[PDB]
Amino acid sequence: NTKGLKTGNEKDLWVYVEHYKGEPVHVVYELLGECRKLADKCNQKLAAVLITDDAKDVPSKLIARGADLVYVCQDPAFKYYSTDEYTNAFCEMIDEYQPSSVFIGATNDGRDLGPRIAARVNTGLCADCTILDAEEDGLIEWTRPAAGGNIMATILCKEHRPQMGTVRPKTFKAMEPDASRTGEVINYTLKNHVDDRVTCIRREEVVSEGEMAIDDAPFVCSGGRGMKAKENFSLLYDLAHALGGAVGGSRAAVDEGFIEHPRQVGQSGKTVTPKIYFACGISGSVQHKAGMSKSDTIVCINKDPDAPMFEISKYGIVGDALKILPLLTAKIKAFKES
Amino acid sequence: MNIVVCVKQVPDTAEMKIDPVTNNLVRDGVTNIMNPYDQYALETALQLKDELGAHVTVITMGPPHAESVLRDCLAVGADEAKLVSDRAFGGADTLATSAAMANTIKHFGVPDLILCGRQAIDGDTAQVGPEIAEHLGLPQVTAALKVQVKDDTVVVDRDNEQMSMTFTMKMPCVVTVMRSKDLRFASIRGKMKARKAEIPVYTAAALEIPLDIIGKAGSPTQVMKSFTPKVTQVHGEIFDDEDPAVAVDKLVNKLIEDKIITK
Ligand SMILES: Cc1cc2nc3c(=O)[nH]c(=O)nc-3n(C[C@H](O)[C@H](O)[C@H](O)COP(=O)(O)OP(=O)(O)OC[C@H]3O[C@@H](n4cnc5c(N)ncnc54)[C@H](O)[C@@H]3O)c2cc1C
Numbered sequence A: 001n002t003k004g005l006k007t008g009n010e011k012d013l014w015v016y017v018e019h020y021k022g023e024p025v026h027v028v029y030e031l032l033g034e035c036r037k038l039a040d041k042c043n044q045k046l047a048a049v050l051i052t053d054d055a056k057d058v059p060s061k062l063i064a065r066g067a068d069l070v071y072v073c074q075d076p077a078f079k080y081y082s083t084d085e086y087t088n089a090f091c092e093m094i095d096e097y098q099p100s101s102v103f104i105g106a107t108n109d110g111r112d113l114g115p116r117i118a119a120r121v122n123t124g125l126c127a128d129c130t131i132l133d134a135e136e137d138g139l140i141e142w143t144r145p146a147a148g149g150n151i152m153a154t155i156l157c158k159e160h161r162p163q164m165g166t167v168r169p170k171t172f173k174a175m176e177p178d179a180s181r182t183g184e185v186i187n188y189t190l191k192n193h194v195d196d197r198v199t200c201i202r203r204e205e206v207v208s209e210g211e212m213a214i215d216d217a218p219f220v221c222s223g224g225r226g227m228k229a230k231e232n233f234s235l236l237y238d239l240a241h242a243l244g245g246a247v248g249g250s251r252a253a254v255d256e257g258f259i260e261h262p263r264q265v266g267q268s269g270k271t272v273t274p275k276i277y278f279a280c281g282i283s284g285s286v287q288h289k290a291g292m293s294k295s296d297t298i299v300c301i302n303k304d305p306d307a308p309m310f311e312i313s314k315y316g317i318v319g320d321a322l323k324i325l326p327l328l329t330a331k332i333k334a335f336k337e338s
Numbered sequence B: 001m002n003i004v005v006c007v008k009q010v011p012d013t014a015e016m017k018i019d020p021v022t023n024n025l026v027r028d029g030v031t032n033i034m035n036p037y038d039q040y041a042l043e044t045a046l047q048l049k050d051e052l053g054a055h056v057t058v059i060t061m062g063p064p065h066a067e068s069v070l071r072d073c074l075a076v077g078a079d080e081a082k083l084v085s086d087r088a089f090g091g092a093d094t095l096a097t098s099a100a101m102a103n104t105i106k107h108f109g110v111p112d113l114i115l116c117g118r119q120a121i122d123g124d125t126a127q128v129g130p131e132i133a134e135h136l137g138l139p140q141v142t143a144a145l146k147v148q149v150k151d152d153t154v155v156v157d158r159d160n161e162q163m164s165m166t167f168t169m170k171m172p173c174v175v176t177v178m179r180s181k182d183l184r185f186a187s188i189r190g191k192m193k194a195r196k197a198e199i200p201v202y203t204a205a206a207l208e209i210p211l212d213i214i215g216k217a218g219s220p221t222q223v224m225k226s227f228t229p230k231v232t233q234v235h236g237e238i239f240d241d242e243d244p245a246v247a248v249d250k251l252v253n254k255l256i257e258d259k260i261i262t263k
C-alpha cells in the first residue's frame, strides 16, 4: 500500500474555487483569507483552483483576495458542478503540479467533491473543519467538530499527500481585495476527457429575481410547527420585509407543507449566521440548532417557556406567535420609518 | 434488482449535551442506535423492494455488538445481513472504512444499487459513501431527498445552496440519502424472524482483504486529540407578560437599547 504517499516535494496550499453564475461563492474568499495565513506560516504559495466554462476576470479577483497562483482549467463541460467532471480535472492538476494541501469549502457540492478526490488520489480528508493551523514544514493541523458538535478533534495527515480538508463556511474572514497584489495564472489543459455518468434533468433556482435567500440574509425570520398553518407564514414575510431579511423554517415546517425545502434550517438543511434569528414556533431540537446556533442574536417566540430554544436565546417572548408577530413587525416598522 | 445498504451503529449523539455551566459532556439517554441517515437509506431500499421487488442486503462493519442493528434491519424486511467484524478494521479513518466496505461489496458481487446514509452522526464526515463509489468505480449522487428507479436508471432529487435538481444515472450506482420517511415499524413477528436468521460474521482474512488497506494501517489520517468544546452560557431576557402588546413593547425597547434593532 504506497499509493498517495508523500514524495517530499509537494508544495503549496490550494483552495477550490466553487462558483455560481461564473463568480466564486463567498466561502472561496473565506478560505483564501485563512489559507493566506497558513501559507505564510510555512513559506509556501497559496493557489486558487478554477475549473470552469469561462474564467471571465475571476483569476484577477482571486489574486486580489490572496492567491499567488491561479490554475485554470476551462471546458464547456464545467459550466455546472459535476462529480465526474470536476474530480477528473482536479485530480489531473494534483498529479501535474503536486500541492502539499487542498482546502475545499464544505458546501453541499464541496462535501461531494472532496471525498471523491481523496479516494481517487488515496489520501487523507478531514471534514467540515472549523480551526486550522500549520507547522513550518507545511503539515496542516485540522480541527473539527464531530458527534453533533459535542466533540472536537484535531487530526493530522502525516504521510499522504495532498493533505485535504473540507472547511465550514462562514467560519473564517475573507481579506479585503487588494489591487496591488500580483500573481500568476496557469492554464491547464485536460489530458483526458470524460463522459459524465450523471445527467441533470432538472435544475431550478431556489430564489427568484432580486429576492433574498436565507443563505446570506442578515435577518432570518423562521417558523416551525407552532406557526400552525402555511398562511401564517405571511407574518414572517412581513417581519422579514420590515428588517430586510428572509424567511426560513424548520424541518417540521417543511413536513407540514408550510415551506419548501430550500428554506429549511438545520443539519439537513442550511446553516445560517444572521445578525438576528427569530425562532417562532420552533422548539429547538438539536438538529435545528445545528443550523442556527451561531447567529449573533437569537430571539425566541414560543408558547412553551421550557422550549429548548430559550436556552440559547438572548431575548424572547413566551406567548402566541400569531398574536406577537404582527405587533412586533408594526413596532419595528414604526421605529425604522421613523 | 439487488440493493446493498451500508448501515452503521452509532451512539445517539443527538442525546449528548454539553452543560454550559460546567462545560462537561452529559450522556444521559445516549445508547447505540442505527444511524439515523442509515435508517433513511434502509427505508428507501425497503420502499424499492415493496414497489419493484428488490433483494436488500444490509452490511455493517463493527464490533460484535453491532450485530443488533443488523437484526433490526432484518426485523423490518431486509432479506440478508452481513457483519464485518475484526480488530484489523479498528481505528479506520474514512479511507480505510470505505476500502473495507468496497472490498466487502466486491467480494459478494457489486449490486445494482448501493445506498448509504448522507453521514454518520458520530464521525459526521459524510465521506464514506462517496469514497466507496470511487473505490468501486461507480457514479454517485449524494444527499438524496428522494430516490426512484425507472428501468435501468436511478432518479435522484438533490439540492445545493442555489439550485433544486434532479439527476439520473444508470446502474450500478451509489446513492447517499439525506431524507426518506421514517423507517417503518418492526412487529413482534418481524423481530422473531430476525432473531432466527443466520447472520454471517466475516473477518478480513475471510474476505481476503489486505491488512494494510484497512484499520489504522490503511488510514492516512489520525485523530491526535479530542476534547469538549467551550460553550458560553446565554442569560436570556425573556418577557412572559399576559398582554402580548406589553411583551412586545418590552422586547422592542430592549432590542433598541442594546443596538440589536437599528434605523
Ligand atoms: C437525522 C435527522 C435530521 C434532522 N434534520 C433537521 C433539520 O435539518 N432541521 C430541523 O428543523 N429539524 C431537523 N430534524 C428534526 C428535529 O428532530 C425536529 O423534529 C424538528 O426540528 C422540530 O421542528 P419544530 O421545532 O418546528 O416542531 P416542534 O418540536 O413540534 O415544536 C413546535 C413548537 O411550537 C410551539 N408552539 C405551538 N404553538 C405556538 C404558537 N401559537 N406560538 C408559538 N409557539 C408555539 C411549541 O411550544 C413548540 O415548542 C432532524 C431529525 C433527524 C433525526
Ligand SMILES: Cc1cc2nc3c(=O)[nH]c(=O)nc-3n(C[C@H](O)[C@H](O)[C@H](O)COP(=O)(O)OP(=O)(O)OC[C@H]3O[C@@H](n4cnc5c(N)ncnc54)[C@H](O)[C@@H]3O)c2cc1C
Pocket: A125, A126, A127, A144, A146, A147, A151, A152, A153, A155, B006, B007, B008, B009, B035, B037, B038, B041, B059, B060, B061, B062, B092, B093, B094, B095, B097, B101, B115, B116, B117, B118, B119, B120, B121, B122, B123, B124, B125, B126, B127, B128, B129, B221, B223, B226
Ligand atoms: C471525533 C472523531 C473525528 C473523526 N474525524 C475524521 C475525519 O475528519 N476524517 C476521517 O477520515 N475519519 C474521521 N474519523 C473516523 C471516522 O468516524 C470513521 O472512519 C468511520 O468509520 C467513518 O466515518 P464517519 O463516521 O464520518 O461516517 P460517514 O462517512 O459520515 O458515513 C457515511 C455513511 O457510510 C456508511 N458507513 C460508515 N461507516 C460504516 C460502517 N462502519 N459500517 C457500514 N456502513 C458505514 C453509512 O451508510 C454512513 O451513513 C473521526 C473519528 C472520530 C471519533
Ligand SMILES: [Cl-]
Pocket: B134, B136, B137, B138, B139
Ligand atoms: Cl469512477
